[PDB]
């Protein structure tokens, strides 16, 4: 059975309980914390690519109002984010299972850009999600996993200084 787990969930939970925020820039900003995933139950010899995308957790614009995040009242449908391919892709099960799969090179942007960078809507709430795609083999297969622990609001600058402080404390 394919098992997918979150490395350093303790740290993600500190950020989540304060409402996590991730900086987006026109050029694209790397994430802190980094999404790291423990994976077991892959065929060491089978071929897989690791994909990352960001689900709009709700259809609302959020705003920091008197030290608290509150949603607008005018939802719009949220077009899904683009997919980031882990640069080790494609690779053997053994490669993916020898150490946590670490998405340290994904960059979050607010502007449609060349490639690499994933465009998010500023002040929308996102839930990171991976797809483990079995490639090359006869039978293509996809397994998807969500990480509620790693939810955040995309911001152009931090609103909650509690978040600013946690980021610096642990980077
Ligand atoms: C060059 C770069 N490492 C790269 C580019 C495309 C893919 N395509 C896939 O694996 C798709 C089937 C899921 C993988 C890696």
From Swiss-Prot:
Residue range from the parent sequence: 41 to 211 of 435
Subcellular location: Nucleus
Annotated phenotype, changing residue 131 to R: In SAVA; reduced DNA binding activity; increased cell growth; altered expression of genes involved in ossification and notochord maintenance
Tissue: Detected in testis, but not in other, normal tissues. Detected in lung tumors (at protein level).
Disease cited in the entry: Neural tube defects: Congenital malformations of the central nervous system and adjacent structures related to defective neural tube closure during the first trimester of pregnancy. Failure of neural tube closure can occur at any level of the embryonic axis. Common NTD forms include anencephaly, myelomeningocele and spina bifida, which result from the failure of fusion in the cranial and spinal region of the neural tube. NTDs have a multifactorial etiology encompassing both genetic and environmental components.
Effect of residue 116 to C: In NTD; uncertain significance
Subunit: Monomer.
Protein name (record): T-box transcription factor T
Function recorded in the entry: Involved in the transcriptional regulation of genes required for mesoderm formation and differentiation. Binds to a palindromic T site 5'-TTCACACCTAGGTGTGAA-3' DNA sequence and activates gene transcription when bound to such a site.
Ranges annotated as DNA-binding: 11-171
